[PDB]
Design a protein around this ligand. Structure first.
Ligand SMILES: *[C@@H]1O[C@H](CO)[C@@H](O[C@@H]2O[C@H](CO)[C@@H](O[C@@H]3O[C@H](CO[C@H]4O[C@H](CO[C@H]5O[C@H](CO)[C@@H](O)[C@H](O)[C@@H]5O)[C@@H](O)[C@H](O[C@H]5O[C@H](CO)[C@@H](O)[C@H](O)[C@@H]5O[C@H]5O[C@H](CO)[C@@H](O)[C@H](O)[C@@H]5O)[C@@H]4O)[C@@H](O)[C@H](O[C@H]4O[C@H](CO)[C@@H](O)[C@H](O)[C@@H]4O[C@H]4O[C@H](CO)[C@@H](O)[C@H](O)[C@@H]4O)[C@@H]3O)[C@H](O)[C@H]2NC(C)=O)[C@H](O)[C@H]1NC(C)=O
Ligand code: Y0F
Ligand code: CA
Ligand code: ZN
Length: 803
């Protein structure tokens, strides 16, 4: 109910929100059907347009105008943005040569450079270069300011998840907005595009920048704008707010443009009709910067030009129908489009089974344009599982396609040529970032980064303390002239033991055998040194990983590799080794195929045993340091230590063996040596975080040996590849993966073929950031380099995309 009898007189775009049933005058009253009767007349004026013409110059003030050209308008903060250019012989901001902003130049009474977020829906990264001829204002921002070639959105690459991620620094699984459409089973409520449920506070998690600001005494303009408010009016409203007295004036503002998303959907990402939407956006940027100039704020304000996601070519005829795969089509609810989420249509149907749904969807057609997953099996880099609003069954749809339930859903609901939502590593989904102002660097290009990092930086720009978030604070310091935040490495929580030889062979009853009884001060003094860590500088290049939680573990040294061995999990947390470009691959000798050897540094009670793998018909074992890369026949025996062994399904050993036998050598060849750190991951509750001992859901049968959900590797070398990985003087280069440890290769449709045709493609899909592995393991890598900690944080957030 709205008693619309009240007035907007003197309240146009008020900053506080008056509660019902009094009428509103804010930038969202239209969306609520709650504006006062006079909102349009007073607050949405349009008379005479948005620009001064010659003959309006020093006119008599006429309150009915949209904006003014009268002499008092700089006083009232309501001149047309082009006022000074037409009436006072000033030039447009874009026509001025750009000049470094070494220090903020703010008018008296400004405590801090204001922040203006200029957000553009569906602004694909390549528009910066491809449309640069028709966007001179945006091109000046970009080339004079700080820019990335692209910014990575979050999955799914839809609007609500990405704008709320921008605002909170959180993954959608933590902020709760996991799609533009959602069902919450606990609430028993649906979130939609059309309607009033989306306004309910319970949907929105974390703490967006406007709440962070407000709680720490920094005032914010209102971020959201009703679609019917024209872009010019949005710009003039922001400019008017910027002339409020010091005690009332917000310090952070947002503008939002529906374009180029709106036209990109109808015309496709590069349709000829896309030029005008881009000209129009530029013109708006131009109005803003002209407006800031008249206010003498153009060298005081920090401006962020930022997109939510890109746009891909997608038409009706590229739709896959679930009704071509499932017999029980009407038993399911599908959330459709550029991603698929599936649940049971009725909760009272116990003849519903995810396993048979998945199996009917799995490599069923030669050219299949979507791949089904249980949500916990999705690539960890998507972080898209830990929320009840995310359905257990998920379809990753190929770029350029839709998935729908039945054909009648498409033609009774082509209308469109563009869409988005796909995997956030897809090139067409990338978006833009430009930062311009006293706090950003001058003419600086920074590497691509993820939009989850931005909340931290916007907090820094405003002197705020960020709420806990998924950004890595420090990783974007190289974007900033000043206001850097100077992080310190976390403290190690557990210190390792350094076991010596403590146990005789015969104390072990592990059911393991090895043909190793074949055996000198020459080569025995030598090997005692290796077990004490004489070659550790070779294999442990960036310090030992720090264990950041309370546990009991041993460092074990070997000729070819070093490991941190957990007495809790009966296996290493990490194994480190360096493969030089000269290193040669060997095979496992015939007599050593089944060889496993007790480790006399580690008690029998804290070792695995071969009996367990014998009795477990589903489970085999692999090794973390690969025997193929051993440096000598004698060194090879170290690779067969029971303390280098890990449980692996046979199906996964196909993947792991090809990685260790073929790909490590190939990376070392290409990168001029590589350092590898490999290990197990336990994330049974799919929250992206290390599981504690009492959360383990699966053991090798009849043992206390826990079964990893994933295996990771981090592969580091020198960024200047003319330098070997073990003698690198400068920046480092990294790629990582987090491979799911599954009992079949159903994910890989070509898996019956040779590993050379499918394994590297799997690994590429499961590419990961070192930071992702840190959360999953409780480990902290790169503790001892000669690089700055900020540079190290950036390296740790890097994702190698292969696109
Ligand atoms: C990405 O970054 C984020 C943020 O850093 C990481 O997410 C955080 O991770 C933490 C560990 O998983 C988690 O800690 C929880 O917190 C539980 C209580 O939390 C509630 O309050 C939170 C605070 O909000 C306030 O913020 C400021 C202060 O900072 C205040 O001043 C304000 O007043 C704010 O209100 C709040 O964030 C949180 O909201 C979530 O849940 C809401 C729905 O109810 C959603 O609206 C919202 O979106 C959040 O939803 C996400 O997170 C939840 C988990 O919290 C998850 O379920 C959702 O799927 C979604 O992902 C809460 O309202 C606290 O109870 C937990 O403690 C339990 O476990 C410990 C183990 O040590 C026990 O000791 C303890 O007893 C307790 O166990 C009890 O309950 C058990 C389970 O029910 C039971 O088995 C047991 O027997 C016990 O009875 C725990 O500390 C953070 O809440 C979470 N934050 C966010 C924002 O999501 C994230 O991990 C990062 N991701 C990666 C990959 O790195
Ligand atoms: O005014 C805003 C919000 C401004 C904002 C600015 C910065 C933010 O964060 C920051 F500041 F940190 F950057 C956060 C929000 N809107 C406008 C209104 C609707 C229209 N729309 C659609 O209905 N869709 C539009 C596009 C689209 N493409 N496919 N479906 C759709 C639906 C959705 C919703 C998006 C947000
Ligand atoms: Ca976990
Ligand atoms: Zn969008």
């Amino acid at each position: 109910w709205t008693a619309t009898s009240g007035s907007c007189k003197g309240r146009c775009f008020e900053l506080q929100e008056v509660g019902p049933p009094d009428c509103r005058c804010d930038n969202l009253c239209k969306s609520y059907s709650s504006c006062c009767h006079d909102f349009d007349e007073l607050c949405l004026k349009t008379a005479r347009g948005w620009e001064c013409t010659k003959d309006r110059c020093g006119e008599v003030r006429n309150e009915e105008n949209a904006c003014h050209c009268s002499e008092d308008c700089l006083s009232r903060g309501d001149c047309c943005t082009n006022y000074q250019v037409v009436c006072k012989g000033e030039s447009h901001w874009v026509d001025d040569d750009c000049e470094e902003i070494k220090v903020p130049e703010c008018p008296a009474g400004f405590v801090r450079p204001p922040l203006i977020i200029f957000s553009v829906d569906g602004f694909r990264a390549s528009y910066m270069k491809k449309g640069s001829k028709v966007m001179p204002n945006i091109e000046k921002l970009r080339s004079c300011g700080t820019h990335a070639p692209y910014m990575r959105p979050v999955y799914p690459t839809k609007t609500f998840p990405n704008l709320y991620t921008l605002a909170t620094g959180l993954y959608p699984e933590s902020h709760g907005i996991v799609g533009n459409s959602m069902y919450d089973p606990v609430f028993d409520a649906s979130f939609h595009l059309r309607g009033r449920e989306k306004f309910n506070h319970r949907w929105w998690g974390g703490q967006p920048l406007w709440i962070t600001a407000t709680k720490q005494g920094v005032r914010a303009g209102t971020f959201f704008w009703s679609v019917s408010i024209p872009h010019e009016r949005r710009i003039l409203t922001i400019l008017q707010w910027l002339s409020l007295p010091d005690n009332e004036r917000p310090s952070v503002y947002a503008f939002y443009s529906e374009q180029p998303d709106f036209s990109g959907h109808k015309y496709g990402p590069f349709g000829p009709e896309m030029t005008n939407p881009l000209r129009e956006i530029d013109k708006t940027v131009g109005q803003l910067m002209d407006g800031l100039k008249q206010l003498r704020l153009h060298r005081c304000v920090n401006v962020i030009f930022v997109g939510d996601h890109g746009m891909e070519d997608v038409t009706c005829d590229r739709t896959e129908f679930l009704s071509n795969y499932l017999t029980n089509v009407d038993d399911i609810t599908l959330v459709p489009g550029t991603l698929g989420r599936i649940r049971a249509k009725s909760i009272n149907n116990s003849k519903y089974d995810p396993k048979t749904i998945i199996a009917a969807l799995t490599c069923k057609k030669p050219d299949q344009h979507f791949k089904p997953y249980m949500k916990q099996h999705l690539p960890k880099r998507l972080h898209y599982a830990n929320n009840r609003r995310i359905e257990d069954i998920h379809l990753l749809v190929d770029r350029r396609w839709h998935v729908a339930r039945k054909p009648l859903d498409v033609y009774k609901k082509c209308f469109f040529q563009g869409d988005h939502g796909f995997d956030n590593k897809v090139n067409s989904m990338q978006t833009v970032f430009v930062g311009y102002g006293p706090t950003f660097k001058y003419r600086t290009k920074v590497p691509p980064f993820e939009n989850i990092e931005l909340y931290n930086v916007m907090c820094d720009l405003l002197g705020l303390k960020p709420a806990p978030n998924n950004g890595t604070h420090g990783s974007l310091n190289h974007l900033l002239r000043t206001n850097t935040f100077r992080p310190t490495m976390p403290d190690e929580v557990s210190r390792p033991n350094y076991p010596g030889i403590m146990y005789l062979q015969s104390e072990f009853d592990l059911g393991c055998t090895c043909d190793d009884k074949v055996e000198n001060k020459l080569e025995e003094l030598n090997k005692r040194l290796h077990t004490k860590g004489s070659t550790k500088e070779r294999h442990l290049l960036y310090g030992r990983p720090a264990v950041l939680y309370r546990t009991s573990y041993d460092i074990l040294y070997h000729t070819d590799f070093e490991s941190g061995y957990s007495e809790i999990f009966l296996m290493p947390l990490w194994t480190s080794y360096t493969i030089s470009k000269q290193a040669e691959v060997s095979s496992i000798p015939e007599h050593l195929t089944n060889c496993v050897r007790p480790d006399v540094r580690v008690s029998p009670g804290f070792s695995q045993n071969c009996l367990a793998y014998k009795n477990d018909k589903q489970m085999s074992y692999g090794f973390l340091f690969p025997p193929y890369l051993s440096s000598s026949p004698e060194a090879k025996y170290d690779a067969f230590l029971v303390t280098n062994m890990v449980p692996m399904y046979p199906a996964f050993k196909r993947v792991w063996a090809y990685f260790q036998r073929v790909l490590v050598k190939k990376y070392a060849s290409e990168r001029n040596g590589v350092n590898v750190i490999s290990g197990p991951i336990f994330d049974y509750n799919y929250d992206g975080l290390r599981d504690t001992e009492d959360e383990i859901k699966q053991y090798v049968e009849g043992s206390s040996i826990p079964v990893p959900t994933h295996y990771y590797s981090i592969i580091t070398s020198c960024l200047d590849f003319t330098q070997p990985a073990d003698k690198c003087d400068g920046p480092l280069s990294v790629s990582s993966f987090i491979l799911p440890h599954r009992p079949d290769n159903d994910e890989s449709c070509n898996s019956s073929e040779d590993e050379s045709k499918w394994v590297e493609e799997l690994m590429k899909m499961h590419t990961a950031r070192v930071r992702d592995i840190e959360h999953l393991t409780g480990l902290d890598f790169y503790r001892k380099t000669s690089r700055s900690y900020s540079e190290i944080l950036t390296l740790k957030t890097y994702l190698h995309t292969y696109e």
